[PDB]
Amino acid sequence: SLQDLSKQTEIPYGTVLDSAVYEHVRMKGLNPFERDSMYSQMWRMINRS
Amino acid sequence: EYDIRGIQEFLDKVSQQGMDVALQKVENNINKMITTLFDTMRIEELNRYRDTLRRAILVMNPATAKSFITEVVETNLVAFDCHWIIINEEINDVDVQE
Amino acid sequence: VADRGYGIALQHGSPYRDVFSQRILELQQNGDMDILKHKWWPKNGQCDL
Amino acid sequence: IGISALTITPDRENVVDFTTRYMDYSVGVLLRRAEKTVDMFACLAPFDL
């Protein structure tokens, strides 16, 4: 599941730069009012460097 | 596209009665607007900003308003206590039902 | 943590509160405030924090 | 007309009209398969030939 993918860090993950998926993830990862924290982990992985 | 010299008498007559009116302008790219806020403000401030959205007035054409409301609701910046006023001169019954 | 910051207090209605802001901005931009902080929170203490 | 994997979004829907959706969107992930855990000689692995 995406939750389990967000807990682990042994396998890195990413997407195509600036694609609609990248904006969609960044929209959630920064949001402090989101009910589900998962995306804050997904964003914290994708955004490195 | 709005010419703010319309509300120029409303802000005047309101600011004598002690209300904390704020302006803002709605961008063409509403997603880049909202994502600028979470990227450029403290959590100390976002919780003050949410308290202002409790009451708001939207002065725009319906096709923009539908899109803005849908995004503000999907981003959970408002909840069941909010009370927004929408004002315009031309809205047909097909749009009210959306 | 949000909603808090360190400070100091004065009498009810003390006008000397007008001094702080611009001078604190000076001290922060000069690093004088950071020099005082380093004076009172130096890194290589007796132990790793 | 336009037809593709084109996705309805609140910013696109401003300038062009859309019909009712004929299939739902979904974000997902591609991963490489894990390979079988079982092996015939797993008990002889600890030392090289």
Side-chain angles (χ1 to χ4, degrees), chain D residues 6-47:
Chain D
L6 183 66
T7 303
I8 294 173
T9 59
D11 54 344
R12 288 183 180 138
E13 186 181 323
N14 182 1
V15 293
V16 291
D17 298 349
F18 289 85
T19 67
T20 289
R21 55 174 180 264
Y22 64 79
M23 170 161 65
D24 288 353
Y25 189 73
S26 173
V27 176
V29 191
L30 188 77
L31 302 100
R32 179 173 164 142
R33 282 188 195 226
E35 306 285 9
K36 212 74 163 80
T37 49
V38 178
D39 190 6
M40 179 171 180
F41 300 99
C43 294
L44 306 185
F47 288 168

CSV table of all heavy atoms in Angstrom, one decimal, chain D residues 6-47:
chain,number,residue,atom,x,y,z
D,6,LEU,N,-7.0,12.6,-20.8
D,6,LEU,CA,-7.2,13.9,-20.2
D,6,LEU,C,-8.0,13.9,-19.0
D,6,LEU,O,-9.1,13.3,-19.0
D,6,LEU,CB,-7.8,14.9,-21.3
D,6,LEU,CG,-8.0,16.3,-20.9
D,6,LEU,CD1,-6.6,17.0,-20.7
D,6,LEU,CD2,-8.8,17.0,-21.9
D,7,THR,N,-7.5,14.5,-17.9
D,7,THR,CA,-8.1,14.4,-16.6
D,7,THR,C,-8.8,15.7,-16.3
D,7,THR,O,-8.3,16.8,-16.5
D,7,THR,CB,-7.1,14.1,-15.5
D,7,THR,OG1,-6.4,12.9,-15.9
D,7,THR,CG2,-7.7,14.0,-14.2
D,8,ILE,N,-10.0,15.6,-15.7
D,8,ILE,CA,-10.8,16.8,-15.2
D,8,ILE,C,-10.0,17.4,-14.0
D,8,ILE,O,-9.6,16.7,-13.1
D,8,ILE,CB,-12.2,16.4,-14.9
D,8,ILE,CG1,-13.0,16.1,-16.2
D,8,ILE,CG2,-12.9,17.6,-14.2
D,8,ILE,CD1,-14.4,15.5,-15.9
D,9,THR,N,-9.9,18.7,-14.0
D,9,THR,CA,-9.3,19.4,-12.9
D,9,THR,C,-9.9,20.8,-12.7
D,9,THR,O,-10.4,21.3,-13.7
D,9,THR,CB,-7.7,19.6,-13.1
D,9,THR,OG1,-7.5,20.3,-14.3
D,9,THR,CG2,-7.0,18.2,-13.1
D,10,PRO,N,-9.9,21.3,-11.5
D,10,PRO,CA,-10.6,22.6,-11.3
D,10,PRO,C,-10.0,23.8,-12.1
D,10,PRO,O,-10.7,24.7,-12.4
D,10,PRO,CB,-10.4,22.8,-9.8
D,10,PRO,CG,-10.3,21.5,-9.2
D,10,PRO,CD,-9.5,20.7,-10.2
D,11,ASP,N,-8.7,23.7,-12.5
D,11,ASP,CA,-8.2,24.8,-13.2
D,11,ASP,C,-8.4,24.6,-14.7
D,11,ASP,O,-8.5,25.6,-15.5
D,11,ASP,CB,-6.7,24.9,-12.9
D,11,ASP,CG,-5.9,23.6,-13.1
D,11,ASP,OD1,-6.6,22.6,-13.2
D,11,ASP,OD2,-4.7,23.7,-13.2
D,12,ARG,N,-8.4,23.4,-15.2
D,12,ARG,CA,-8.8,23.1,-16.6
D,12,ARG,C,-10.2,23.4,-16.9
D,12,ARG,O,-10.6,24.1,-17.9
D,12,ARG,CB,-8.4,21.7,-17.0
D,12,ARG,CG,-7.0,21.4,-17.2
D,12,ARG,CD,-6.8,20.0,-17.7
D,12,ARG,NE,-5.4,19.6,-17.8
D,12,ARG,CZ,-4.9,18.4,-17.5
D,12,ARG,NH1,-5.6,17.4,-17.0
D,12,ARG,NH2,-3.6,18.2,-17.6
D,13,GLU,N,-11.1,23.0,-16.0
D,13,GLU,CA,-12.5,23.1,-16.1
D,13,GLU,C,-13.0,24.5,-16.2
D,13,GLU,O,-14.2,24.8,-16.4
D,13,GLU,CB,-13.2,22.3,-15.0
D,13,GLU,CG,-14.7,22.2,-15.1
D,13,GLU,CD,-15.3,21.4,-13.9
D,13,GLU,OE1,-14.6,20.5,-13.4
D,13,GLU,OE2,-16.4,21.8,-13.4
D,14,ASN,N,-12.1,25.5,-16.0
D,14,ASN,CA,-12.5,26.9,-16.0
D,14,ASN,C,-12.8,27.3,-17.5
D,14,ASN,O,-13.8,28.0,-17.7
D,14,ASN,CB,-11.4,27.8,-15.4
D,14,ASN,CG,-11.8,29.2,-15.4
D,14,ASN,OD1,-12.9,29.6,-15.8
D,14,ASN,ND2,-10.9,30.1,-14.9
D,15,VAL,N,-12.0,27.0,-18.4
D,15,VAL,CA,-12.1,27.5,-19.8
D,15,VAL,C,-12.7,26.5,-20.8
D,15,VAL,O,-13.1,27.0,-21.9
D,15,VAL,CB,-10.7,27.9,-20.3
D,15,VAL,CG1,-10.2,29.1,-19.5
D,15,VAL,CG2,-9.7,26.8,-20.2
D,16,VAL,N,-12.9,25.2,-20.5
D,16,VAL,CA,-13.4,24.3,-21.4
D,16,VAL,C,-14.4,23.4,-20.6
D,16,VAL,O,-14.2,23.1,-19.4
D,16,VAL,CB,-12.3,23.4,-22.0
D,16,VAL,CG1,-11.5,24.3,-23.0
D,16,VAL,CG2,-11.4,22.8,-21.0
D,17,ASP,N,-15.5,23.0,-21.3
D,17,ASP,CA,-16.5,22.1,-20.7
D,17,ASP,C,-16.1,20.6,-20.8
D,17,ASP,O,-15.4,20.2,-21.7
D,17,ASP,CB,-17.9,22.3,-21.3
D,17,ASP,CG,-18.4,23.8,-21.1
D,17,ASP,OD1,-17.7,24.5,-20.3
D,17,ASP,OD2,-19.4,24.1,-21.8
D,18,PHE,N,-16.6,19.8,-19.9
D,18,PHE,CA,-16.3,18.4,-19.9
D,18,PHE,C,-17.6,17.6,-19.8
D,18,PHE,O,-18.6,18.1,-19.1
D,18,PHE,CB,-15.4,18.0,-18.7
D,18,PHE,CG,-14.0,18.4,-18.9
D,18,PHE,CD1,-13.6,19.7,-18.5
D,18,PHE,CD2,-13.0,17.6,-19.4
D,18,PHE,CE1,-12.3,20.1,-18.6
D,18,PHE,CE2,-11.7,18.0,-19.5
D,18,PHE,CZ,-11.4,19.2,-19.2
D,19,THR,N,-17.7,16.5,-20.4
D,19,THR,CA,-18.8,15.5,-20.2
D,19,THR,C,-18.6,14.8,-18.9
D,19,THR,O,-17.6,14.9,-18.1
D,19,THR,CB,-18.8,14.5,-21.3
D,19,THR,OG1,-17.7,13.7,-21.3
D,19,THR,CG2,-18.9,15.3,-22.7
D,20,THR,N,-19.6,14.0,-18.5
D,20,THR,CA,-19.4,13.1,-17.4
D,20,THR,C,-18.3,12.1,-17.7
D,20,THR,O,-18.0,11.7,-18.8
D,20,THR,CB,-20.7,12.3,-17.2
D,20,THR,OG1,-21.8,13.2,-16.7
D,20,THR,CG2,-20.5,11.1,-16.2
D,21,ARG,N,-17.6,11.8,-16.6
D,21,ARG,CA,-16.4,10.9,-16.7
D,21,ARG,C,-16.8,9.5,-17.1
D,21,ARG,O,-17.7,8.9,-16.5
D,21,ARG,CB,-15.6,11.0,-15.4
D,21,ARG,CG,-16.3,10.6,-14.2
D,21,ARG,CD,-15.3,10.5,-13.0
D,21,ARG,NE,-16.0,10.1,-11.8
D,21,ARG,CZ,-16.4,11.0,-10.8
D,21,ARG,NH1,-16.3,12.3,-11.0
D,21,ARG,NH2,-17.0,10.5,-9.7
D,22,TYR,N,-16.1,8.9,-18.0
D,22,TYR,CA,-16.3,7.5,-18.4
D,22,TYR,C,-15.4,6.5,-17.6
D,22,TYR,O,-15.6,5.3,-17.7
D,22,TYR,CB,-16.1,7.3,-19.9
D,22,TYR,CG,-14.7,7.6,-20.5
D,22,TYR,CD1,-13.7,6.7,-20.4
D,22,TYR,CD2,-14.5,8.8,-21.1
D,22,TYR,CE1,-12.5,6.9,-20.9
D,22,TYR,CE2,-13.2,9.1,-21.6
D,22,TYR,CZ,-12.2,8.1,-21.5
D,22,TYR,OH,-11.0,8.4,-22.0
D,23,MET,N,-14.3,7.0,-16.9
D,23,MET,CA,-13.5,6.2,-16.1
D,23,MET,C,-12.9,7.0,-15.0
D,23,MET,O,-12.5,8.2,-15.2
D,23,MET,CB,-12.5,5.4,-16.9
D,23,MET,CG,-11.5,4.7,-16.0
D,23,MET,SD,-10.6,3.4,-16.8
D,23,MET,CE,-9.7,4.3,-18.1
D,24,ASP,N,-12.7,6.4,-13.8
D,24,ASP,CA,-12.1,7.1,-12.7
D,24,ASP,C,-10.6,7.2,-12.8
D,24,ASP,O,-10.0,6.2,-13.2
D,24,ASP,CB,-12.6,6.5,-11.4
D,24,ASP,CG,-14.0,6.7,-11.0
D,24,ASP,OD1,-14.7,7.5,-11.8
D,24,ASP,OD2,-14.5,6.1,-10.1
D,25,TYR,N,-10.1,8.3,-12.3
D,25,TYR,CA,-8.6,8.5,-12.2
D,25,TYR,C,-8.1,7.8,-10.9
D,25,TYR,O,-8.8,7.5,-10.0
D,25,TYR,CB,-8.3,10.0,-12.2
D,25,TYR,CG,-6.8,10.3,-12.3
D,25,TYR,CD1,-6.2,10.1,-13.5
D,25,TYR,CD2,-6.1,10.8,-11.2
D,25,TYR,CE1,-4.8,10.4,-13.6
D,25,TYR,CE2,-4.8,11.1,-11.3
D,25,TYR,CZ,-4.1,10.9,-12.5
D,25,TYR,OH,-2.8,11.2,-12.7
D,26,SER,N,-6.8,7.5,-10.9
D,26,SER,CA,-6.2,7.0,-9.7
D,26,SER,C,-4.6,7.1,-9.8
D,26,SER,O,-4.1,6.8,-10.9
D,26,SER,CB,-6.6,5.5,-9.5
D,26,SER,OG,-5.9,5.0,-8.4
D,27,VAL,N,-4.0,7.5,-8.7
D,27,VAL,CA,-2.5,7.5,-8.6
D,27,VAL,C,-2.1,6.1,-8.1
D,27,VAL,O,-2.6,5.6,-7.2
D,27,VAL,CB,-2.1,8.6,-7.7
D,27,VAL,CG1,-0.5,8.5,-7.5
D,27,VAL,CG2,-2.5,10.0,-8.2
D,28,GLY,N,-1.1,5.6,-8.8
D,28,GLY,CA,-0.5,4.3,-8.4
D,28,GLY,C,1.0,4.2,-8.6
D,28,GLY,O,1.6,5.2,-9.0
D,29,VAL,N,1.5,3.0,-8.4
D,29,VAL,CA,3.0,2.8,-8.3
D,29,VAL,C,3.3,1.5,-9.1
D,29,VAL,O,2.6,0.5,-9.1
D,29,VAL,CB,3.5,2.7,-6.9
D,29,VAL,CG1,5.0,2.8,-6.9
D,29,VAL,CG2,2.9,3.8,-6.1
D,30,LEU,N,4.5,1.6,-9.8
D,30,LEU,CA,5.1,0.4,-10.5
D,30,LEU,C,6.3,-0.1,-9.7
D,30,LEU,O,7.1,0.7,-9.3
D,30,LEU,CB,5.5,0.7,-11.9
D,30,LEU,CG,6.0,-0.4,-12.8
D,30,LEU,CD1,4.8,-1.2,-13.3
D,30,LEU,CD2,6.8,0.1,-13.9
D,31,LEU,N,6.3,-1.4,-9.4
D,31,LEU,CA,7.4,-2.0,-8.6
D,31,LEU,C,7.9,-3.3,-9.3
D,31,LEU,O,7.1,-4.0,-9.9
D,31,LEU,CB,7.1,-2.3,-7.2
D,31,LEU,CG,6.6,-1.0,-6.4
D,31,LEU,CD1,5.1,-1.0,-6.3
D,31,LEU,CD2,7.2,-1.1,-5.0
D,32,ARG,N,9.2,-3.5,-9.2
D,32,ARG,CA,9.7,-4.8,-9.7
D,32,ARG,C,9.3,-6.0,-8.7
D,32,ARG,O,9.3,-5.8,-7.5
D,32,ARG,CB,11.3,-4.7,-9.8
D,32,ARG,CG,12.0,-5.9,-10.2
D,32,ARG,CD,13.4,-5.6,-10.5
D,32,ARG,NE,14.2,-6.9,-10.6
D,32,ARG,CZ,15.3,-7.0,-11.4
D,32,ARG,NH1,15.6,-6.1,-12.3
D,32,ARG,NH2,16.0,-8.2,-11.3
D,33,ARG,N,9.0,-7.1,-9.3
D,33,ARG,CA,8.6,-8.3,-8.6
D,33,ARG,C,9.8,-8.8,-7.7
D,33,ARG,O,11.0,-8.6,-8.0
D,33,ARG,CB,8.1,-9.4,-9.5
D,33,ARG,CG,6.7,-9.2,-10.0
D,33,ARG,CD,6.2,-10.4,-10.7
D,33,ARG,NE,5.0,-10.0,-11.5
D,33,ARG,CZ,3.9,-10.8,-11.6
D,33,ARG,NH1,3.8,-11.9,-10.9
D,33,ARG,NH2,2.9,-10.3,-12.3
D,34,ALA,N,9.4,-9.4,-6.6
D,34,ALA,CA,10.4,-9.8,-5.5
D,34,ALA,C,11.2,-11.0,-5.8
D,34,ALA,O,12.2,-11.2,-5.1
D,34,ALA,CB,9.6,-9.9,-4.2
D,35,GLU,N,10.8,-11.8,-6.8
D,35,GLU,CA,11.3,-13.2,-7.0
D,35,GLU,C,11.0,-14.1,-5.9
D,35,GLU,O,10.7,-13.7,-4.7
D,35,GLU,CB,12.9,-13.1,-7.1
D,35,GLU,CG,13.3,-12.1,-8.2
D,35,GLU,CD,13.1,-12.6,-9.6
D,35,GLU,OE1,12.5,-13.7,-9.8
D,35,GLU,OE2,13.7,-12.0,-10.6
D,36,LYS,N,11.1,-15.4,-6.1
D,36,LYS,CA,10.7,-16.4,-5.2
D,36,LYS,C,11.7,-16.4,-4.0
D,36,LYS,O,12.9,-16.3,-4.2
D,36,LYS,CB,10.7,-17.8,-5.8
D,36,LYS,CG,9.7,-18.8,-5.2
D,36,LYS,CD,8.2,-18.4,-5.7
D,36,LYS,CE,7.3,-19.6,-5.4
D,36,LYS,NZ,6.9,-19.7,-4.0
D,37,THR,N,11.1,-16.6,-2.8
D,37,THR,CA,12.0,-16.7,-1.6
D,37,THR,C,12.5,-18.1,-1.5
D,37,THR,O,13.7,-18.2,-1.0
D,37,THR,CB,11.1,-16.4,-0.3
D,37,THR,OG1,9.9,-17.1,-0.3
D,37,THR,CG2,10.9,-14.9,-0.2
D,38,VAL,N,11.8,-19.1,-1.9
D,38,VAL,CA,12.3,-20.5,-1.7
D,38,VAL,C,13.4,-20.8,-2.7
D,38,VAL,O,13.4,-20.2,-3.8
D,38,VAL,CB,11.1,-21.5,-2.0
D,38,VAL,CG1,11.6,-22.9,-1.9
D,38,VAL,CG2,10.0,-21.2,-1.0
D,39,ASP,N,14.4,-21.6,-2.3
D,39,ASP,CA,15.4,-22.0,-3.1
D,39,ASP,C,15.8,-23.5,-2.7
D,39,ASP,O,15.6,-23.9,-1.6
D,39,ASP,CB,16.7,-21.1,-2.9
D,39,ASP,CG,17.8,-21.4,-4.0
D,39,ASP,OD1,17.5,-22.3,-4.9
D,39,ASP,OD2,18.9,-20.9,-3.9
D,40,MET,N,16.3,-24.2,-3.7
D,40,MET,CA,16.6,-25.6,-3.5
D,40,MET,C,17.8,-25.9,-2.6
D,40,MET,O,17.9,-26.9,-1.9
D,40,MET,CB,16.8,-26.3,-4.9
D,40,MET,CG,17.1,-27.8,-4.8
D,40,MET,SD,17.1,-28.5,-6.5
D,40,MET,CE,17.5,-30.2,-6.0
D,41,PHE,N,18.8,-25.0,-2.7
D,41,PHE,CA,20.0,-25.2,-2.0
D,41,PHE,C,20.3,-24.1,-0.9
D,41,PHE,O,21.4,-23.9,-0.5
D,41,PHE,CB,21.2,-25.2,-3.0
D,41,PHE,CG,21.1,-26.3,-4.0
D,41,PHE,CD1,20.6,-26.0,-5.2
D,41,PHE,CD2,21.5,-27.6,-3.7
D,41,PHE,CE1,20.5,-27.0,-6.2
D,41,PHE,CE2,21.4,-28.6,-4.6
D,41,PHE,CZ,20.9,-28.3,-5.9
D,42,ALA,N,19.2,-23.5,-0.4
D,42,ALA,CA,19.4,-22.4,0.6
D,42,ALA,C,20.2,-22.8,1.8
D,42,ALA,O,20.9,-22.0,2.4
D,42,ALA,CB,18.0,-21.9,1.1
D,43,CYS,N,20.2,-24.1,2.2
D,43,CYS,CA,20.9,-24.6,3.3
D,43,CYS,C,22.4,-24.7,3.1
D,43,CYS,O,23.2,-24.9,4.0
D,43,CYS,CB,20.4,-25.9,3.8
D,43,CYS,SG,18.7,-25.8,4.5
D,44,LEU,N,22.9,-24.7,1.8
D,44,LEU,CA,24.3,-24.8,1.5
D,44,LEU,C,25.0,-23.4,1.2
D,44,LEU,O,26.2,-23.4,0.9
D,44,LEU,CB,24.5,-25.8,0.4
D,44,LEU,CG,23.9,-27.1,0.6
D,44,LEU,CD1,24.3,-28.1,-0.6
D,44,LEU,CD2,24.3,-27.8,1.9
D,45,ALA,N,24.2,-22.3,1.3
D,45,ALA,CA,24.8,-21.0,0.9
D,45,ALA,C,25.9,-20.5,1.8
D,45,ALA,O,26.7,-19.8,1.3
D,45,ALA,CB,23.6,-20.0,0.8
D,46,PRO,N,25.9,-20.8,3.1
D,46,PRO,CA,26.8,-20.0,4.0
D,46,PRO,C,28.3,-20.0,3.6
D,46,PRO,O,29.0,-19.0,3.9
D,46,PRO,CB,26.6,-20.7,5.4
D,46,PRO,CG,25.3,-21.1,5.3
D,46,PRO,CD,25.1,-21.7,3.9
D,47,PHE,N,28.8,-21.0,2.9
D,47,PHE,CA,30.2,-21.1,2.4
D,47,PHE,C,30.2,-21.1,0.9
D,47,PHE,O,29.2,-21.7,0.3
D,47,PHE,CB,30.9,-22.3,2.9
D,47,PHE,CG,31.3,-22.2,4.4
D,47,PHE,CD1,31.7,-23.3,5.1
D,47,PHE,CD2,31.2,-21.0,5.1
D,47,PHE,CE1,32.1,-23.3,6.4
D,47,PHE,CE2,31.6,-21.0,6.5
D,47,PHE,CZ,32.0,-22.1,7.1
